[PDB]
Design a binder for these strands. Sequence first.
RNA 1: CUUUACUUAUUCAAUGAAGCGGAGCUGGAAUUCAUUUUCCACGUUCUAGCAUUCAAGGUCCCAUUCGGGGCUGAUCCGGGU
RNA 2: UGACUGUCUAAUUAAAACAUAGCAUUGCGAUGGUCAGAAAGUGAUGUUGACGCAAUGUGAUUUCUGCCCAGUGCUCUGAAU
RNA 3: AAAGGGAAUCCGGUUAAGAUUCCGGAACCUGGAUAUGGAUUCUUCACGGUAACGUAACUGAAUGUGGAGACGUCGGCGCGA
Lengths: 230, 247, 121, 68, 56
Amino acid sequence: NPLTHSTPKNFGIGQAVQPKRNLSRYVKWPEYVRVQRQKKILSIRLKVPPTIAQFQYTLDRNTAAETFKLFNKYRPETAAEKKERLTKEAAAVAEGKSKQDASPKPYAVKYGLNHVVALIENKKAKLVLIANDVDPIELVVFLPALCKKMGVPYAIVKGKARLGTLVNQKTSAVAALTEVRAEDEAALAKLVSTIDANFADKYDEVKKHWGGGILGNKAQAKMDKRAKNS
Amino acid sequence: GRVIRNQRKGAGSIFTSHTRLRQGAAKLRTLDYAERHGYIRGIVKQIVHDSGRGAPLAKVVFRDPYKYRLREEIFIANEGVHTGQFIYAGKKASLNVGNVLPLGSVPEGTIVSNVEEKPGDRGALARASGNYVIIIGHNPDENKTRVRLPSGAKKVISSDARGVIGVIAGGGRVDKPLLKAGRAFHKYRLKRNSWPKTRGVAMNPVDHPHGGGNHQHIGKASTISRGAVSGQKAGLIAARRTGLLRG
Amino acid sequence: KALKVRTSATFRLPKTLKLARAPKYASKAVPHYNRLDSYKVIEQPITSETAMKKVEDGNILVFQVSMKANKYQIKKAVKELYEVDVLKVNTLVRPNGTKKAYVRLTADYDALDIANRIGYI
Amino acid sequence: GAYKYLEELQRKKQSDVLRFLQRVRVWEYRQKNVIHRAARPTRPDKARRLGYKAKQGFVIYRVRVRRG
Amino acid sequence: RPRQYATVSKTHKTVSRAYGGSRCANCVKERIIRAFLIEEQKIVKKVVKEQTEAAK
RNA sequence: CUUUACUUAUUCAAUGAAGCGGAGCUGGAAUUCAUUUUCCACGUUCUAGCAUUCAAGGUCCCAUUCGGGGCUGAUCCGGGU
RNA sequence: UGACUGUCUAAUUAAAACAUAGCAUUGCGAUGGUCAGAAAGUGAUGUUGACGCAAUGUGAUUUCUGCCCAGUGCUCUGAAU
RNA sequence: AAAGGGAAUCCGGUUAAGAUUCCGGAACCUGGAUAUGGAUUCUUCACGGUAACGUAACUGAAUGUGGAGACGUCGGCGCGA
Ligand SMILES: [Mg+2]
Ligand SMILES: [Mg+2]
Ligand SMILES: [Mg+2]
Ligand SMILES: [Mg+2]
Ligand SMILES: [Mg+2]
Ligand SMILES: [Mg+2]
Ligand SMILES: [Mg+2]
Ligand SMILES: [Mg+2]
Ligand SMILES: [Mg+2]
Ligand SMILES: [Mg+2]
Ligand SMILES: [Mg+2]
Ligand SMILES: [Mg+2]
Ligand SMILES: [Mg+2]
Ligand SMILES: [Mg+2]
Ligand SMILES: [Mg+2]
Ligand SMILES: [Mg+2]
Ligand SMILES: [Mg+2]
Ligand SMILES: [Mg+2]
Ligand SMILES: [Mg+2]
């Protein structure tokens, strides 16, 4: 084409006003964006104790998917299912003449912090899931130690939202299985065996290890430069 | 018993500057990628007179690197710059009078002006007329530069602080006698209300520490402590010596 | 992870949806009537000797009008009440706090006959 | 219940576990406004025992005041 | 006066040359001469720089 | 009861928070010493001109609609302005 | 007697008093000097930068400014049970 | 800001007392709508002059640049009312 030519612009210094580049690294973000970014920066710059940072070791993706596959079989009743079984019980009370033999025994996950803590204390919990992302952390930070103390198996698992979805909440912060049906006892035993290997059997060694201390990108670069050069 | 005249200057009622006619804050160009990595060419379009300042100001127009427009900066004109002169500002600038380049990238004995104290505060040192800063040192292991200021003070600045080559224009201004209170009146009329100065010995004792008495004398010593308080410091504050500078 | 390519280093407030008001009850639900209609505007004629010399000579009807009426409202009120067409309105606030309008009718209308039809002179 | 554990844990203010959280939280509270709305109590047990029930109409405000 | 320029026609506010009512026929002449000569010296500088970087 | 290292608290300053930090083509006075032990340079200096339309070009796709969207031009990574 | 022009005690003092230019001394290189504010993410100088700002003394020009650092004041990389 | 910057109104007459405001004549400015004539157009967005520039017109968004607004005081000289 003899009508089109090659201009190329000289985007150096002092020539050819600069093109639109991705300036997302340099955006003056809102103050809440900066606070929530520098907060997760500051929580890993400082030397975290071993009571926090026994969190951020989380149940990994395959065994968390297995854990939620088991725990979704024991979802609690929705409001619609509660209304259906309450109508079924009101039928058997009014005309069926059956006392408490209308609905069968429920198998469901246990949830709520006080309820789950009391189940751990009374040694009824067969498996406890602890959300890694609660705020304040003081609500669950005693729970690995309490679960190790009463011998129930715990798993610090990723997502208070994910734990809330299986209990039909927005956020659950713990979940617990206290009893399963007969067909899930082998699945629960396999899960407890692969969860205890990461959480309860590593507790006494994680209890001595401080987390954090992580330098930034630039500071780590200029620290391994000095380490290499000395 | 009365608040005295040097104490009254901090409230800043009538003692503010008279800044109607001033061209703007005479500052260096802001430290950007062009000035930090290469150079940028601006053009002197006017050498104007600043009011209340003894030195002229060079209105130097640069091109904005990121938006198509023109960014006009107000430099203090070094002595020798002219209209239509290309002013090259940055690290890779050449050693010509008027260029704005860092103190690390100049030789020893270079004479700069409008030179910074910290890299990027846009001109702090040697800005009055005829004044200059001599570059007497470099310390590349700590990125410093030893300079000699107009007062004789040796100062250590960063080597990334900038300065404009040359002496500030308008030199030799104080060598002419003002000859009259009219010329002093019109001098201070565009600076600030620091004139005329009544002597404190002419005052009453309520107006000044020096005031009062049947004879105009000072009474106590004029040399006042540095740790003295506001209201006592009317004399020679924290004087190391007094009398004529002879040995 | 796709990241939004921001060519500006400024964050601005996003254009969220602004809904219109859909109130559960009206603010007053009985609207006020016309606060300044033709009878509120044209209060009374002015029948001084000067104001009557303006009627048969200058084709000008002199009125005392509302203090809240502008020349559009005075023109509309004179056209609506007295069925004339108005060439000009010249108002002044009198030194007793009333307003006086000099309403010049067009040459089609004789202001002395309009004044006679109204009732004064 | 968990609030007994929160009660006994909050008393240990010079332990490592709360000393870290005091630092990490005092930075963030300083970065926010002087009077700002708290979305939920950072001491839920202390809120409950001082009167707060977690329902509509109960509000937490965080606030900093100059010492001395 | 500055708002009277809104009243008059386009002829009264400009000259038919480039930079009509902005520049004054010798400034325009200088801008043209400078634009021609510097953009030829740029070509000369380009081939001299290419020669000197192609020699070694 | 001495010194200097870290940065995230705290303090200072600037900017429309634009090019920060690390790593990557040539070149050599690395005598490649088989290896970038190894450093510097990152498109602009006769001239009071001009520089803007997601950029021309190169290339791919559309389903092509006389137009549109990618990649590149303008290296990659880290979102620490 | 004050160099001069100028200024002031409105309503008893217009002066030889105040100011002045000239001279001199002092402090300060900004994380600063001098001075405000109850405080402040606060101010004046300062749209400033030693030919500048701030504190004083003397008071055009000519010709000079002698001795005393014991006292008091100011100041000093200085003395270390 | 009724003394600074500023879109545009003048003459004649008129009242006991109003007028650059009323009346008569003659204008101008701003905002809006919009038709007709002209102009430009098969070289689609005019032409002449070497040129300074001329004309009744004679497309021009973003963006940029420039001008006007917009400027001391004194002295004599020139021109006008
Ligand atoms: Mg932080
Ligand atoms: Mg001011
Ligand atoms: Mg004096
Ligand atoms: Mg006296
Ligand atoms: Mg009136
Ligand atoms: Mg009126
Ligand atoms: Mg920036
Ligand atoms: Mg006298
Ligand atoms: Mg008197
Ligand atoms: Mg008298
Ligand atoms: Mg005197
Ligand atoms: Mg004398
Ligand atoms: Mg003596
Ligand atoms: Mg005016
Ligand atoms: Mg008249
Ligand atoms: Mg009159
Ligand atoms: Mg008229
Ligand atoms: Mg036609
Ligand atoms: Mg024509």
